[PDB]
DNA sequence: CGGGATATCCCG
DNA sequence: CGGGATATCCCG
């Protein structure tokens, strides 16, 4: 339990289209906005909001396909390119630096999480 | 032999 | 409009 703070770095059309890249991309300042001083249960709630935000950023919303806002509308974390899986981890996930200081959230690919955490 | 993750199941 | 309980991922 706990509430999100942060909010940090602004985002373009091109958000996670370096995600498999070093820490991946940052959590979007628009997003971070609405997300601030917010009472979360779990880190999986945040994840579950998060993703929802996403959805109802028009700017964020149009670099993802209809399958996945659909995702995101309920929650789901949105499909990488197949080149940036890992095994049956299929899709973008939350990495946190060493919980709800989304200045230490990023989104990376399930691939290069590993490859950090390694 | 533990640590860091996403997702579904289902609420009398 | 939530979220606890539970399953299962993938690392050496
Ligand atoms: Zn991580």
Redesign the pocket.
């Known amino acids: 339990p706990g509430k999100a703070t942060g909010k940090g770095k602004p985002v373009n059309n091109k958000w996670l289209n370096n995600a498999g890249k070093d820490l991946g991309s940052p959590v979007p300042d628009r997003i971070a906005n609405k997300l601030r001083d917010k009472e979360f ?5 945040f ?1 579950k ?1 998060f993703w929802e935000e996403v959805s109802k950023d028009p700017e964020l919303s149009k670099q993802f396909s209809r399958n996945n806002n659909d995702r995101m509308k309920v929650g ?2 949105p499909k990488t390119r197949t080149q940036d899986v ?4 299929t ?1 973008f ?4 630096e ?1 919980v709800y200081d989304m200045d230490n959230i990023s989104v990376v690919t399930p691939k290069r ?2 490859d950090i ?2």
């Open positions: 249960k779990s880190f999986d709630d994840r909001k789901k974390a890992s095994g049956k981890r899709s996930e939350l990495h946190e060493k999480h590993i955490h390694r």
